Design a protein around this ligand. Structure first.
Ligand SMILES: COc1cc(CCc2cnc(Nc3ccc(N4CCC(N5CCN(C)CC5)CC4)c(OC)c3)nc2)cc(OC)c1
Length: 289
């Protein structure tokens, strides 16, 4: 179906180097001429999501679905924003802002201290708290647009040239304008190590399950992109979650942040803070630093 305000001229777009592939799409760099409606002459670097070479019928509806979620949500400094789409007379391309510094996971990994006898700017504690705050701000806006992410992890935050956090990947994102929750009812491919028990066991999704994931992102930030539950099979995760295991506090983490972290990991969804609260919380910490 047509949507002319979002539609983009195909001949103004030149596809470039791959950025990586996901579940139902692949991403490439591209040049889009006159994407900046204030400098209609000059080519802008954008990202383009399109179907993969082995794409199913469902992949196509999933990608259209993700494009609609973005149009819905609206613009925010801490969310990756929709720029346009070629939807008519050719393969679906979705045009999206390009984050120059990749995803946060690799970002953090790439700037760990090398070691005394090793090598090939530096991050500070305040930098890490800033990242957490920005993400919290974007999730706060996301939640107030009556939408659930369902895939919040360091790999799904992208970092611009200016070190701005941008939430990405509306692959599992769901509109909850109605009931204000989501029930999966079906089996699927799930980011299991980031997911709250109620979501994992009982398949119930809320802003509050997103909060749990955000807790895990916190852990990822302060370990500078550590993997939760490394090489642990799903059955063991289940066991450890049922048993009430929580992750240990990272070295680079203060007590204050570990409390905000554990707070996100209350068994009862209702006992967890909201994104709004989390912003306040991280604002305070950002201040004392
Ligand atoms: C709803 O949210 C979204 C989000 C997007 C992602 C839109 C988007 C996606 N990516 C980027 N930037 C970017 C920049 C760099 C890299 N890399 C650079 C280092 C590389 N490295 C070198 C050696 N080796 C080959 C592997 C490791 C590979 C990764 C990268 O990989 C992730 C990504 N900006 C925007 C699209 C979308 O379409 C609907 C919707």
């Amino acid at each position: 179906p047509e949507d002319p305000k979002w539609e983009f001229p195909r001949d103004k777009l030149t596809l470039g180097k791959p950025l990586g592939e996901g579940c139902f799409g692949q991403v490439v760099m591209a040049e889009a001429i006159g994407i900046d409606k204030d400098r209609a002459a000059k080519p802008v670097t954008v990202a383009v999501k399109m179907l993969k070479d082995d794409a199913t019928d469902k992949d196509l509806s999933d990608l259209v679905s993700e494009m609609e979620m973005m149009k819905m949500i609206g613009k925010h400094k801490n969310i990756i924003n929709l720029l346009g789409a070629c939807t008519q007379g050719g393969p679906l391309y979705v045009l999206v802002e390009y984050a120059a510094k990749g995803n946060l996971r690799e970002f953090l990994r790439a700037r760990r201290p090398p070691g005394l006898d090793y090598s090939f700017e530096q991050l500070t504690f305040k930098d890490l708290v800033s990242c957490a705050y920005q993400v919290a701000r974007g999730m706060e806006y996301l939640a107030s647009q009556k939408c659930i992410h369902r895939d919040l992890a360091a790999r799904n935050v992208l970092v611009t040239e200016d070190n701005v956090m941008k939430i990405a990947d509306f692959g599992l994102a769901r509109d909850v304008h109605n009931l204000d929750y989501y029930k999966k009812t079906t089996n699927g491919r799930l980011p299991v190590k980031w997911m709250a028990p109620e979501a994992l066991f009982d398949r119930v999704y809320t802003h509050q399950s997103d909060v749990w994931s955000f807790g895990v992102l916190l852990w990822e930030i302060f370990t500078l992109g550590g993997s939760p539950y490394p090489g642990i099979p799903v059955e063991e995760l289940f066991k450890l979650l049922k048993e009430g295991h929580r992750m240990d506090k990272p070295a680079n983490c203060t007590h204050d942040l570990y409390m905000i972290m554990r707070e996100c990991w209350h068994a009862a969804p209702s006992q967890r803070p909201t994104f709004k609260q989390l912003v306040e919380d991280l604002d305070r910490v950002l201040t004392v630093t």
